[PDB]
Structure formats: C-alpha cells, structure tokens
Amino acid sequence: PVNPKPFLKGLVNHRVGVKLKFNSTEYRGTLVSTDNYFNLQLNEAEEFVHGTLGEIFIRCNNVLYIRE
Amino acid sequence: DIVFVSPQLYLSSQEGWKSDSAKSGFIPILKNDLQRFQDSLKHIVDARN
Amino acid sequence: RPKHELSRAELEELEEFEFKHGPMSLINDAMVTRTPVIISLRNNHKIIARVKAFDRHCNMVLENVKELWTEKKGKNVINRERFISKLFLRGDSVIVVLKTP
Amino acid sequence: DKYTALIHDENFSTLTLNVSRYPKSLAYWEKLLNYIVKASAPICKSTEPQLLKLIRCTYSSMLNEFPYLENYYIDFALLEYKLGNVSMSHKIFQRGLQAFNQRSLLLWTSYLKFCNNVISHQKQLFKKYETAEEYVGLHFFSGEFWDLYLEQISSRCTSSKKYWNVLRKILEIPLHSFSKF
Amino acid sequence: MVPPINCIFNFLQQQTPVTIWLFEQIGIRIKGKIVGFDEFMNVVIDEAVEIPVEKGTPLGKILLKGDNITLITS
Amino acid sequence: VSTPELKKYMDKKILLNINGSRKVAGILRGYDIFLNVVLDDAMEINGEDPANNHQLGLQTVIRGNSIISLEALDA
Amino acid sequence: AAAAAAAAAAAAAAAAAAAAAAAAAAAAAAAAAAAAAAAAAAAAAAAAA
Amino acid sequence: TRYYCEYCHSYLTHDTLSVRKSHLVGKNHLRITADYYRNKARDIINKHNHKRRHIGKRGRKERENSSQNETLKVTCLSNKEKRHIMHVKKMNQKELAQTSIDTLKLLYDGSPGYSKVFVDANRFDIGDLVKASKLPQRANSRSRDETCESNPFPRLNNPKKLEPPKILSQWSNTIPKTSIFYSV
Amino acid sequence: GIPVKLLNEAQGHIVSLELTTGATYRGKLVESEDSMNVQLRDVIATEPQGAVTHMDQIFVRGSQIKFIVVPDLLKNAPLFKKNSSRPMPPIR
Amino acid sequence: KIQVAHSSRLANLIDYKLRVLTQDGRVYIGQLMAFDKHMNLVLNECIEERVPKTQLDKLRPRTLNIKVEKRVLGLTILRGEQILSTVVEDKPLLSKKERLVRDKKEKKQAQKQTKLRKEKEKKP
Amino acid sequence: MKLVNFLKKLRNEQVTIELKNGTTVWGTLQSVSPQMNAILTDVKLTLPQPRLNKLNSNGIAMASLYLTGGQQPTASDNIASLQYINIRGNTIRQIILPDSLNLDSLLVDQKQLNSLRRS
RNA sequence: AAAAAAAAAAGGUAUGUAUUAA
RNA sequence: AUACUUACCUUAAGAUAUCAGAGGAAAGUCCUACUGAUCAAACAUGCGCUUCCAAUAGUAGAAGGACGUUAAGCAUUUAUCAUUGAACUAGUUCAUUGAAGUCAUUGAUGCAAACUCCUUGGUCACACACACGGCGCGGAAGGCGUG
Ligand SMILES: [Zn+2]
Structure with missing residues (x-):
C-alpha cells in the first residue's frame, strides 16, 4: 500500500530513470533529493532518447513517470 | 421482426406489395400477422373475382 | 505536513530548507560558486549562462547568457547563436538545468 | 427492453393491422402513431434506435398517404429536432413545402421560426424570407408572417433602410390585419 | 454516489489490473496494478507495461504523474 | 472549494467529450471538486456506431482536466 | 397530489415524501375524531347538570 | 464573506450556494429585480438623445434664395394638451408592443394535429422545458392523444365566424358608409 | 469579481458560448458557479467545422470556456455602478 | 492617434474602447467596463476580428490590404486564461x-x- | 522570496519582453504587477525571421501582430509600433534588461534583510 | 499550619399563516 | 411594517510607503500630527512645451462605419462511405441493402470599383491680408516642473 511520496523517500540515492513527456527522453541516474512538488535532483545522470551528465535538476511539470 | 406492406400494390395484383426494407408508402406490420393480414383482404379480392 | 497549518515564520524556515537542502540546492550551489549552468527551455533551445539570482518558481536572473538554437526544414539544419549580457528568465519555460564541472 | 415489450403487446398488433386493412381512414393512422409515441415517451437520444426507426418510418409513411397535413410535417420536424439532428428537420420541412407546391402559410411560418435559431449567415436567412415572400406573401392572413420578417430586420439590420423598404410594401397588401402595420 | 478517488481506492485494494490512457500527444497507454495514490491523482503502478498506439516493453514499479492522466480503466 | 453540481445528472446515461477528439458515453456514478467523473459501462463512441465502438471497463474514472463539455442523453 | 408535488421535488424522494404526507393526513383525521369525542363528552356534561 | 444583493439592497451573511440560490429565486427579490430592469429599460426610450448642434454661417446665396420663400406657421400645443397627448401616444406604443397577431392559431383550431403543435406544452422542442418552467406552486388542458375521430363535422352550430379585421381609430371615418349586401 | 457576478446575473437568459476547442453553444443558461463552469438548457451547438446540432441539456467546464455572450440589457445593471452606497452590514 | 497617460493601469482605464489579443490570434475591440484579479474583463459592444487562413499569406514579408472577417457580439465576458495583451483604441x-x-x-x-x-x- | 519584486525596481528602463509566441517587444517599462503583468509605453514589437530558405514564421503571431492596429501598411518586414501595450504575465518567456544597471544594488531584497535583522 | 462555587442569546435569507382603510 | 410556523446557513490570516538618524518604554520589539531623504495620491498652478479641434467667397470635405446596394458583379474550386448483383476495360456505368449526412452552389474563395446611407467635430473670433517659416479666445488629449 505504498503511496507516491514514501515511494520517492524509498528511492532516494538509488538508480532511477525518469521519462519526460516530450521526446520520450529518459534521464537515468542516482536520485539526490526531491521537493514537495517532486522536483528532482540527480547525480551521474545519462540522457537516453547516449550521453553522460554530471549533475541534473529536473522541474516537476516536464516529467512523465519515475521508475527504478 | 417486422414486414412492410402495401395493400394498394397487393390488391392491384402487383408484385412488390411487401419488402423487408423501409419504402415510402408501406405500413409496418408484425411478420407473424402478415399471413393474418392476407386473410383480412381476401374477401375484397373475392368480390373482384 | 500541509502548508496551510504552518505560521508565517515556519514558511520562511521551510523555504530556507528547500533552497539549502533540496533539489534547487543544485542552483544555489551554482550561484555561490560562480559555476556556469546549462538550461534547456521547452521552446527547444538552450542557454549557457551564469546565475545571479533564482527563485521558488525557478525564474532566475542571469549574467553573460549565451543562447543556442538550431532549426531544420526538410532536414536542412542551421545552428544559430545569440549573445546576451544580462537576462531575466521566467521559470515555467525551463525543463532541465545542469551544473557544469 | 422497451422495443420488444412494445412488439409483443396486443394493442400494437391490433392498431397496426387496422391501419394496414384501412389505409385511408387516417383515424387508425393517428391512433397507431399516438400510441407508438406514448410507448417511447422518454423520446430523447437515449431510446434505442430500432424504436426510433419504427416511429420515424410511421410518420414518413403516414405523410405519404395524406400529402396535406401541416401540423404533422411540423410535428415530425420537431421530433427530429428534439432528437438532435437539424438536417433531417430541414429536409422534411422542404418535403412538406414541396407537397403544397411551396405555398402554405403554416409551413412557411413554422419553418422560418425554426430557421431563425438554427441558421447563421444573415444573408441566406433572409433569402429564405425572400423565397417565402414571393410565394405566400399575399395570403390574406400572412400578416403574422410579415411580423416575423419585420421582427428579423430590426434585430439584424443596423441600417434601417430595409425596414422602410419592406414595411412600404406591406402597406399596399390587402391583409387581414393591415392596421397593425 | 461513488466518489471517483474512492473508486480508485477500490482499484488499490481489490488488486484489479487497469489500463490507463495518457494525453493524446504522447501516444502510449500504460497498464498495471495500481498500488497507491496521492491527492493529485498521481499513482504508483506495479508491474506496468507501456503499449504504443502489444509488443510494448515491461516497465516495473513506476510512479506516474497525475498531470498526464486521462482515463483509468479496468 | 465548491463542488460542481451534477446532482441531477448522476445515474443517467451521459455522453462527454474527452480532449478534442474522443467522446465517451457511460452511466455517471460519482464526481468530485475537480470534476473527476467516475462512470460505469463506458463505451468509446466513433464514426461507425455499432462497429468502431468498443467498451472500456466495468468502472472508469476520468480526470476533470480532460473534460470539455458534458451532455446527458436522458431525462 | 402527485402532479402538484412532483415538479419541484426530486423523483427519488417523491415516494417517501408521499408516504409521509399520507401519514400526516391520517394523523389529522385522528385529531379531528378526538376533538369530536371531546365535544360529545362536553355535551353530555352540559346535559347532566 | 457576505453576499450583498444590490437589487434588494439587503445583505445576506456568509454566502452559500443554497442560501444564495434561495434568495435569487425568492419572490420578493424577483419583483424587485424585474421592476429594476423595467425602469432601466424604460429609461433608454425615455431619455432624449439631445445631440449637439453645429451651426455654420449661412451663405449669402441661400439667404437670398430662402428669403423669397415664405415663412411657414408652426403649431404648439398647450401644456395641458401636450401632457395628455404624450400619455396617449405612450399608451399606444405599449399597445403595439403587446399585439402579436395569433389568428393562425384560431384558424387551425379543429385541425387533426392542432394538439401537437399549437398547444406548445406537449410539443417536442419547447415541450419538455415548460414542465421545468412551471412555478414552484407553493400553496393554495388539451392532451396530445386527440384524434380526428372527435369533432368529425367541424360545423354543427359550434364555430364562431371569423372576427372582422380591425381599423384605425383615427381614420375610422374613412370606412365606406354602407355595405354592398344585407347581412342579418 | 464583477465579471463572474455578471455571469450569475445572466441566469435564466439566452447566452452564447465559445469553447477553446472552437465550438459554439448558444442556449439558455440554467446554472453557473464561481468556477465559471455553467450548465445550459435547450441549446443549439455548432461544431468547430460548422456542423450544427441540438441538445436539451449541457454542462461545460469553465476552464474550457473562451468568451460568453450575455444579453445586452445587463450592461446598465447595478454591478457597474462605481460610486454606490451600501447600508451597514448586520451584526452576527 | 491616441495618447494614453504615460502611467495608466487597467484600473485607471475604464470605458475606453480597447483592443484585446487572445492566444488564438483573434481580437475583441470594445469598451472595457470591469476586470478581475486574474484579468478576465467585460467588454460592452465588441467585435471579434479574424485574419482568415487565406489572407494570412499576405502578411508574410516581401501597401497591404487585409480582409479581416469579423463578427459582432455585444456585452461579453472574456476569460483571463485566453487573454494575451491589451492595447488602447479610442478614448x-x-x-x-x-x-x-x-x-x-x-x-x-x-x-x-x-x-x-x-x-x-x-x-x- | 518573490523575484518578481526585482522587476518592480526596473521601472523606467528600456527592455525587451520576449514572449512565448516568439514576439519580441522593445519598450520603456512601467509598473510590473505581482503576477508579472508588464505594462510598457512606447513599444516596437516584432517577430524574428527564421531564414532557413523561407521557413514559415508563427502563423498566430502574424495575425495577432496585424490585429494590434499598430502595424503600418508600408513596413517591408514584420513589425509594429504602438504606445501603451499591456502584457499578461504568463505570456512572458525571457526579459532582456539593459547592460548599464548594476544587479548588486537591485538584487538586494528588503524583506530578506528585514527577516534576518529582526531575528 | 492550610481551605472551598458563576455571570449570556446571537442575528441573515426564503416559504406559509394573521393583522395594518370606504 | 409587525407576530407565529417551516426550511437554508454562519468569521482564510495579516497589513496600509520605504530608508536613515535622534529620543522614551547588550538584545530585539513598539512608539514619537519628532528630524531628514526617497516614493505615492489628491489638489492647485505654470511653462513662446507637443498634437488635434470641418465649406459658406460655398452645394463641399475629414475620421469612422454599413451585421448596405449594384450583385446570380468578374475570376476560380467544390458536393458523401461501405456490401451484393449485371455489363465493362484488365478502373467505369446501373440496380438493390446498411451507416452517418449544418444550411447553402443565387453558395464558398480570391479581385476590384461605383453608388447610397449612418455617427462624429469650435462647422468659434479676427481676417482675404506677398512670406523665410507664430507668439487671438477657448475645448480635447498628453509630457515636463514648482507649491
Ligand atoms: Zn435580493
């Protein structure tokens, strides 16, 4: 019976992919922290749409879904 | 379910007095009553014979 | 805990925490350390710049902005660059913001 | 369902067989119709299409046997309008006006009354009234028709030229109510 | 009356599988087992697969945002 | 803040247009302040009435954001 | 009585509203009968004196 | 908050959909508001345009051409007269507002479909609405099913002959004095 | 605000709608809320491409409304009085 | 043409005939009367002007004359969500x-x- | 903190408000509402030309630009000049402020200090 | 050596019933 | 307007320019028709400040419109899908069955002109005066400045 917010609290500092709603782009990286709006911070992220990205901030409105 | 009948075309001996599809002048009647319907007109035909 | 219960100062401590410890701490640490950031908008072109200020809504004030936008028609591409000294960016357009090494 | 519950009823078989035995009575047609309507009474878009097909074919087959019934072309038009398709309403108004050779006062008045609501494009709307005028305009009771048409100018037209233009023509017609104009 | 989020809670505990349509722009529909939800109608789906619009790839336990939700259908 | 007033609509078969293109018909069950509407015996209407129409599920819920207009075909 | 109260009131509460109305009318009739009995007793008390 | 109803000018405290809906439907509020728009509507007809006058210098030509033209007499009624004639004219406009000649409905009264069209309660387009338009009727027919089988012969001492066409009161002396034929 | 209060003042009168989808719903306004979502009675509908139909009852979401056309005689309605004098509110 | 007060806000200007731009590329011209927090405003006598798809090619860069199809709708109430920018037409x-x-x-x-x-x- | 309170101190400055349409507005700036509603005075607002061998520009922004009444007939390119445009807040994308003003003086918010000075 | 009780309805809108003149 | 009966319901919070200095009840707060600076509003008041305000020495003209006519103007482009049978080239016509089907084809799109009609203005005063680009009285709309 897990809800979304404890699900993000359980996914901290685990490898998580996040699919944005636009190009079917997903950022694969270790989650750092989340806001109350589910803003995302990531370390060692990689952009799949192939690249490697050091640190990332993702705004809440553009994400489609979050997976592990 | 329902048959479409033209007592004018029937009493005039013409062929198409009935059809399954809806046409301009026909009257919808129950299919089982169709035979019954013929009975109701026979005396009229009997008067013309 | 919902926001309507808290008092006027508890919201100030909450925003101070969210900026200091939270996702937007990526931007905050970028403002203090003078590290240039890359920003992708939803308009599909990307500014390489330096953050003088930021805010809750993510709208932020920038200095030495360099905008990069490409366009293609029938698979004919051209890359265009546009330089700006100082800028104010409304935060609803942005999607991803990364902190350069 | 309601359809099959209507078929197996005895009244539908009796009324129907009476109609098909006695076509030109118009008493059995109107009972058959008034009954099959009342069986359908929630006649809105929810009722199943078999029943609507039967009642519709009943109207259209009655109006063919009696090409002059004005209130039945109107009534069947209004059934099609409550049912949600105005194109079928237009078409069967055209059908009724054609049965009368384009001159009947009630079908033109009750038609244009319908036409005010469902038709934009002021020009075409007025072309309907100019077509009605050259046909039924001189009818002795046609004044109420003109009362519509004048009513439609003063609301639509900013110029007021056309109101003087038309009302000047109404002055010369020997209607039942001339004095109103 | 059956409030809608009550019905969703009846999707959580009854363990019925659901197909869920997204916005018309994305072009994929998700299906899985709705586990729990928030006030914003963003839901966690266990054993979810993304079908383009039946060869879709399986996702996982995935949090899906409520902004893109159109239908939740059993 | 205020609950939308559908109170006369519920339990009546209703057609409502999802986004721009789609039109869903079903018997309204419940609703909320965001106009999220849950209904049963849902059917997705299309050009060919018997043919392209396909049922959705025993219970379907709709996000109020995708609701445009709601018409009841019923009393 | 049904046509008068059916317009404004919802149809689902029309039944229980109708039953409550009939019950109220019956109670009114009962009160009338009791008043009549009291009147008879008063008449008898006036006749005895 | 509080909902101030400016038509009635009376406050209602802590606005709620129920209480506000009850007040707006209320009979008193109804009369007050309806009368309010009756006044605000009668004003635009009552108000005189009073458009501004722009007077130019008359030229030497048209003063000479207009001097040879004789001066016309003007008529001006007394105050007591003009008050009465304004009353009469206004009451005549109010009459032309409400006329709405229905004679077609009187012609078809015995038609076979008269009950489905002109009764307007039992119609299709307007039929269902009239039911919800019926007042709450707080305290204190012509069914559609009719057929031609009733009143088979429209004339058996039943009908009144058609009402004569009206005439203007002003010009009523214009009428031909005598009829051509002898009516009973 | 005044714009919504004018929509509440238009109840029971024929109004026109434009939804942001492009359609046009003209008919009589039964209900309206402060969320601008209204329900209309006996309304004629114009699809975005012009096809016109008729429906007895409709409910529309206020977020999808673009403009609403209201009977003109509401222009001089008391909502638009700038300097107005209210009495004292009752004490509760 | 018309000079608006150098500092004039939407509250200062009432009864001025305005020109309102929406997101869809159409314009509502008329007298403003009220407005609101989220800037949905009430126009008195207003006419929506539209550039057809067929005339639009005439506006692309090369005296231009555009046929702007417009229809008259009186006493409307706009929605703040649709409004884009506002300009003053007359006084x-x-x-x-x-x-x-x-x-x-x-x-x-x-x-x-x-x-x-x-x-x-x-x-x- | 609300960074919009910064824009309210930028009053009476030359600015470009670059909107979501791609439309750009050069003008003198007046009071900015708390919702970022930006009201300007003497403005020249235009659309950029994507070159790319005739790539059709925004079709909605051309119509919205001709419908301001400020586009003059003899303009060869696509521009309009007018006085007093009022812009809704959610339409703004970017704002390019002049190079001359210093941020260190304007970026100090008096409420931020006031909270710290009082504690 | 220590000690002991409390003070109160509010007022808005709507519906029905009765009263306020030859 | 008063009395009685029944129904529907009740308080988002806070604040009223900012900055600085001096004083009263080491830290902070509150306060001073206290002192300065800046800002804002109202009211006055000025600028050789800017723009605009129509013929009568004539039957005109400027701005804006017509949801006006010519006008079936001229030039273009459009009028449903599925199933079965017959003929047919190797797609076409006719008949039947089903589905939906804004009206229009005198339409819709583009092009242009002529005519007619509506609303608006100081239709003010002095002047019919050979100059190198003013300094009549007002009204409308602004900008700037002082109090
Ligand atoms: Zn009131």
Whole structure:
C-alpha cells in the first residue's frame, strides 16, 4: 500500500530513470533529493532518447513517470 | 421482426406489395400477422373475382 | 505536513530548507560558486549562462547568457547563436538545468 | 427492453393491422402513431434506435398517404429536432413545402421560426424570407408572417433602410390585419 | 454516489489490473496494478507495461504523474 | 472549494467529450471538486456506431482536466 | 397530489415524501375524531347538570 | 464573506450556494429585480438623445434664395394638451408592443394535429422545458392523444365566424358608409 | 469579481458560448458557479467545422470556456455602478 | 492617434474602447467596463476580428490590404486564461471633467439614497 | 522570496519582453504587477525571421501582430509600433534588461534583510 | 499550619399563516 | 411594517510607503500630527512645451462605419462511405441493402470599383491680408516642473 511520496523517500540515492513527456527522453541516474512538488535532483545522470551528465535538476511539470 | 406492406400494390395484383426494407408508402406490420393480414383482404379480392 | 497549518515564520524556515537542502540546492550551489549552468527551455533551445539570482518558481536572473538554437526544414539544419549580457528568465519555460564541472 | 415489450403487446398488433386493412381512414393512422409515441415517451437520444426507426418510418409513411397535413410535417420536424439532428428537420420541412407546391402559410411560418435559431449567415436567412415572400406573401392572413420578417430586420439590420423598404410594401397588401402595420 | 478517488481506492485494494490512457500527444497507454495514490491523482503502478498506439516493453514499479492522466480503466 | 453540481445528472446515461477528439458515453456514478467523473459501462463512441465502438471497463474514472463539455442523453 | 408535488421535488424522494404526507393526513383525521369525542363528552356534561 | 444583493439592497451573511440560490429565486427579490430592469429599460426610450448642434454661417446665396420663400406657421400645443397627448401616444406604443397577431392559431383550431403543435406544452422542442418552467406552486388542458375521430363535422352550430379585421381609430371615418349586401 | 457576478446575473437568459476547442453553444443558461463552469438548457451547438446540432441539456467546464455572450440589457445593471452606497452590514 | 497617460493601469482605464489579443490570434475591440484579479474583463459592444487562413499569406514579408472577417457580439465576458495583451483604441465618449461631474452627482445621489432609506426605516 | 519584486525596481528602463509566441517587444517599462503583468509605453514589437530558405514564421503571431492596429501598411518586414501595450504575465518567456544597471544594488531584497535583522 | 462555587442569546435569507382603510 | 410556523446557513490570516538618524518604554520589539531623504495620491498652478479641434467667397470635405446596394458583379474550386448483383476495360456505368449526412452552389474563395446611407467635430473670433517659416479666445488629449 505504498503511496507516491514514501515511494520517492524509498528511492532516494538509488538508480532511477525518469521519462519526460516530450521526446520520450529518459534521464537515468542516482536520485539526490526531491521537493514537495517532486522536483528532482540527480547525480551521474545519462540522457537516453547516449550521453553522460554530471549533475541534473529536473522541474516537476516536464516529467512523465519515475521508475527504478 | 417486422414486414412492410402495401395493400394498394397487393390488391392491384402487383408484385412488390411487401419488402423487408423501409419504402415510402408501406405500413409496418408484425411478420407473424402478415399471413393474418392476407386473410383480412381476401374477401375484397373475392368480390373482384 | 500541509502548508496551510504552518505560521508565517515556519514558511520562511521551510523555504530556507528547500533552497539549502533540496533539489534547487543544485542552483544555489551554482550561484555561490560562480559555476556556469546549462538550461534547456521547452521552446527547444538552450542557454549557457551564469546565475545571479533564482527563485521558488525557478525564474532566475542571469549574467553573460549565451543562447543556442538550431532549426531544420526538410532536414536542412542551421545552428544559430545569440549573445546576451544580462537576462531575466521566467521559470515555467525551463525543463532541465545542469551544473557544469 | 422497451422495443420488444412494445412488439409483443396486443394493442400494437391490433392498431397496426387496422391501419394496414384501412389505409385511408387516417383515424387508425393517428391512433397507431399516438400510441407508438406514448410507448417511447422518454423520446430523447437515449431510446434505442430500432424504436426510433419504427416511429420515424410511421410518420414518413403516414405523410405519404395524406400529402396535406401541416401540423404533422411540423410535428415530425420537431421530433427530429428534439432528437438532435437539424438536417433531417430541414429536409422534411422542404418535403412538406414541396407537397403544397411551396405555398402554405403554416409551413412557411413554422419553418422560418425554426430557421431563425438554427441558421447563421444573415444573408441566406433572409433569402429564405425572400423565397417565402414571393410565394405566400399575399395570403390574406400572412400578416403574422410579415411580423416575423419585420421582427428579423430590426434585430439584424443596423441600417434601417430595409425596414422602410419592406414595411412600404406591406402597406399596399390587402391583409387581414393591415392596421397593425 | 461513488466518489471517483474512492473508486480508485477500490482499484488499490481489490488488486484489479487497469489500463490507463495518457494525453493524446504522447501516444502510449500504460497498464498495471495500481498500488497507491496521492491527492493529485498521481499513482504508483506495479508491474506496468507501456503499449504504443502489444509488443510494448515491461516497465516495473513506476510512479506516474497525475498531470498526464486521462482515463483509468479496468 | 465548491463542488460542481451534477446532482441531477448522476445515474443517467451521459455522453462527454474527452480532449478534442474522443467522446465517451457511460452511466455517471460519482464526481468530485475537480470534476473527476467516475462512470460505469463506458463505451468509446466513433464514426461507425455499432462497429468502431468498443467498451472500456466495468468502472472508469476520468480526470476533470480532460473534460470539455458534458451532455446527458436522458431525462 | 402527485402532479402538484412532483415538479419541484426530486423523483427519488417523491415516494417517501408521499408516504409521509399520507401519514400526516391520517394523523389529522385522528385529531379531528378526538376533538369530536371531546365535544360529545362536553355535551353530555352540559346535559347532566 | 457576505453576499450583498444590490437589487434588494439587503445583505445576506456568509454566502452559500443554497442560501444564495434561495434568495435569487425568492419572490420578493424577483419583483424587485424585474421592476429594476423595467425602469432601466424604460429609461433608454425615455431619455432624449439631445445631440449637439453645429451651426455654420449661412451663405449669402441661400439667404437670398430662402428669403423669397415664405415663412411657414408652426403649431404648439398647450401644456395641458401636450401632457395628455404624450400619455396617449405612450399608451399606444405599449399597445403595439403587446399585439402579436395569433389568428393562425384560431384558424387551425379543429385541425387533426392542432394538439401537437399549437398547444406548445406537449410539443417536442419547447415541450419538455415548460414542465421545468412551471412555478414552484407553493400553496393554495388539451392532451396530445386527440384524434380526428372527435369533432368529425367541424360545423354543427359550434364555430364562431371569423372576427372582422380591425381599423384605425383615427381614420375610422374613412370606412365606406354602407355595405354592398344585407347581412342579418 | 464583477465579471463572474455578471455571469450569475445572466441566469435564466439566452447566452452564447465559445469553447477553446472552437465550438459554439448558444442556449439558455440554467446554472453557473464561481468556477465559471455553467450548465445550459435547450441549446443549439455548432461544431468547430460548422456542423450544427441540438441538445436539451449541457454542462461545460469553465476552464474550457473562451468568451460568453450575455444579453445586452445587463450592461446598465447595478454591478457597474462605481460610486454606490451600501447600508451597514448586520451584526452576527 | 491616441495618447494614453504615460502611467495608466487597467484600473485607471475604464470605458475606453480597447483592443484585446487572445492566444488564438483573434481580437475583441470594445469598451472595457470591469476586470478581475486574474484579468478576465467585460467588454460592452465588441467585435471579434479574424485574419482568415487565406489572407494570412499576405502578411508574410516581401501597401497591404487585409480582409479581416469579423463578427459582432455585444456585452461579453472574456476569460483571463485566453487573454494575451491589451492595447488602447479610442478614448471615452465623455471627457475627464465631465466624468468628474457625473461622478460627483452620482455620489451625492447615492448619499441621498442612504438618508431617504434610513429615515424611511427609522420612524415607521 | 518573490523575484518578481526585482522587476518592480526596473521601472523606467528600456527592455525587451520576449514572449512565448516568439514576439519580441522593445519598450520603456512601467509598473510590473505581482503576477508579472508588464505594462510598457512606447513599444516596437516584432517577430524574428527564421531564414532557413523561407521557413514559415508563427502563423498566430502574424495575425495577432496585424490585429494590434499598430502595424503600418508600408513596413517591408514584420513589425509594429504602438504606445501603451499591456502584457499578461504568463505570456512572458525571457526579459532582456539593459547592460548599464548594476544587479548588486537591485538584487538586494528588503524583506530578506528585514527577516534576518529582526531575528 | 492550610481551605472551598458563576455571570449570556446571537442575528441573515426564503416559504406559509394573521393583522395594518370606504 | 409587525407576530407565529417551516426550511437554508454562519468569521482564510495579516497589513496600509520605504530608508536613515535622534529620543522614551547588550538584545530585539513598539512608539514619537519628532528630524531628514526617497516614493505615492489628491489638489492647485505654470511653462513662446507637443498634437488635434470641418465649406459658406460655398452645394463641399475629414475620421469612422454599413451585421448596405449594384450583385446570380468578374475570376476560380467544390458536393458523401461501405456490401451484393449485371455489363465493362484488365478502373467505369446501373440496380438493390446498411451507416452517418449544418444550411447553402443565387453558395464558398480570391479581385476590384461605383453608388447610397449612418455617427462624429469650435462647422468659434479676427481676417482675404506677398512670406523665410507664430507668439487671438477657448475645448480635447498628453509630457515636463514648482507649491
Ligand atoms: Zn435580493
């Protein structure tokens, strides 16, 4: 019976992919922290749409879904 | 379910007095009553014979 | 805990925490350390710049902005660059913001 | 369902067989119709299409046997309008006006009354009234028709030229109510 | 009356599988087992697969945002 | 803040247009302040009435954001 | 009585509203009968004196 | 908050959909508001345009051409007269507002479909609405099913002959004095 | 605000709608809320491409409304009085 | 043409004929009367002007004459979500002095109403 | 903190408000509402030309630009000049402020200090 | 050596019933 | 307007320019028709400040419109899908069955002109005066400045 917010609290500092709603782009990286709006911070992220990205901030409105 | 009948075309001996599809002048009647319907007109035909 | 219960100062401590410890701490640490950031908008072109200020809504004030936008028609591409000294960016357009090494 | 519950009823078989035995009575047609309507009474878009097909074919087959019934072309038009398709309403108004050779006062008045609501494009709307005028305009009771048409100018037209233009023509017609104009 | 989020809670505990349509722009529909939800109608789906619009790839336990939700259908 | 007033609509078969293109018909069950509407015996209407129409599920819920207009075909 | 109260009131509460109305009318009739009995007793008390 | 109803000018405290809906439907509020728009509507007809006058210098030509033209007499009624004639004219406009000649409905009264069209309660387009338009009727027919089988012969001492066409009161002396034929 | 209060003042009168989808719903306004979502009675509908139909009852979401056309005689309605004098509110 | 006050906000301007731009590329021209927090405003006599898809090619860069199809809709209430920008077309039928006059007379009449109501309630 | 309170101190400055349409507005700036509603005075607002061998520009922004009444007939390119445009807040994308003003003086918010000075 | 009780309805809108004149 | 009966319901919070200095009840707060600076509003008041405000020495003209006519103007482009049978080239016509089907084809799109009609203005005063680009009285709309 897990809800979304404890699900993000359980996914901290685990490898998580996040699919944005636009190009079917997903950022694969270790989650750092989340806001109350589910803003995302990531370390060692990689952009799949192939690249490697050091640190990332993702705004809440553009994400489609979050997976592990 | 329902048959479409033209007592004018029937009493005039013409062929198409009935059809399954809806046409301009026909009257919808129950299919089982169709035979019954013929009975109701026979005396009229009997008067013309 | 919902926001309507808290008092006027508890919201100030909450925003101070969210900026200091939270996702937007990526931007905050970028403002203090003078590290240039890359920003992708939803308009599909990307500014390489330096953050003088930021805010809750993510709208932020920038200095030495360099905008990069490409366009293609029938698979004919051209890359265009546009330089700006100082800028104010409304935060609803942005999607991803990364902190350069 | 309601359809099959209507078929197996005895009244539908009796009324129907009476109609098909006695076509030109118009008493059995109107009972058959008034009954099959009342069986359908929630006649809105929810009722199943078999029943609507039967009642519709009943109207259209009655109006063919009696090409002059004005209130039945109107009534069947209004059934099609409550049912949600105005194109079928237009078409069967055209059908009724054609049965009368384009001159009947009630079908033109009750038609244009319908036409005010469902038709934009002021020009075409007025072309309907100019077509009605050259046909039924001189009818002795046609004044109420003109009362519509004048009513439609003063609301639509900013110029007021056309109101003087038309009302000047109404002055010369020997209607039942001339004095109103 | 059956409030809608009550019905969703009846999707959580009854363990019925659901197909869920997204916005018309994305072009994929998700299906899985709705586990729990928030006030914003963003839901966690266990054993979810993304079908383009039946060869879709399986996702996982995935949090899906409520902004893109159109239908939740059993 | 205020609950939308559908109170006369519920339990009546209703057609409502999802986004721009789609039109869903079903018997309204419940609703909320965001106009999220849950209904049963849902059917997705299309050009060919018997043919392209396909049922959705025993219970379907709709996000109020995708609701445009709601018409009841019923009393 | 049904046509008068059916317009404004919802149809689902029309039944229980109708039953409550009939019950109220019956109670009114009962009160009338009791008043009549009291009147008879008063008449008898006036006749005895 | 509080909902101030400016038509009635009376406050209602802590606005709620129920209480506000009850007040707006209320009979008193109804009369007050309806009368309010009756006044605000009668004003635009009552108000005189009073458009501004722009007077130019008359030229030497048209003063000479207009001097040879004789001066016309003007008529001006007394105050007591003009008050009465304004009353009469206004009451005549109010009459032309409400006329709405229905004679077609009187012609078809015995038609076979008269009950489905002109009764307007039992119609299709307007039929269902009239039911919800019926007042709450707080305290204190012509069914559609009719057929031609009733009143088979429209004339058996039943009908009144058609009402004569009206005439203007002003010009009523214009009428031909005598009829051509002898009516009973 | 005044714009919504004018929509509440238009109840029971024929109004026109434009939804942001492009359609046009003209008919009589039964209900309206402060969320601008209204329900209309006996309304004629114009699809975005012009096809016109008729429906007895409709409910529309206020977020999808673009403009609403209201009977003109509401222009001089008391909502638009700038300097107005209210009495004292009752004490509760 | 018309010079708007160098500092004038949406509240300063009433009864001016405005020109309103929406997200869809159509314009509503008319007198503003009210507005709101989220900037949905009420126009008195307004006409929506539209550039057809067929005339649009005429606006692309090369005296241009555009046929702008427009329809008249009186006393509307716009929605703040759709509004994009607002421009001033004309100035009101009345001058500033005259509007001061009618404002003062309206206020005096309003006070007279409160007195006539208070003393009609008090004695009876 | 609300960074919009910064824009309210930028009053009476030359600015470009670059909107979501791609439309750009050069003008003198007046009071900015708390919702970022930006009201300007003497403005020249235009659309950029994507070159790319005739790539059709925004079709909605051309219509919205001709419908301001400020586009003059003899303009060869696509521009309009007008006085007093009022812009809704959610339409703004970027704002390019002049190079001359210093941020260190304007970026100090008095409420931020006031909270710290009082504690 | 220590000690002991409390003070109160509010007022808005709507519906029905009765009263306020030859 | 008063009395009685029944129904529907009740308080988002806070604040009223900012900055600085001096004083009263080491830290902070509150306060001073206290002192300065800046800002804002109202009211006055000025600028050789800017723009605009129509013929009568004539039957005109400027701005804006017509949801006006010519006008079936001229030039273009459009009028449903599925199933079965017959003929047919190797797609076409006719008949039947089903589905939906804004009206229009005198339409819709583009092009242009002529005519007619509506609303608006100081239709003010002095002047019919050979100059190198003013300094009549007002009204409308602004900008700037002082109090
Ligand atoms: Zn009231």
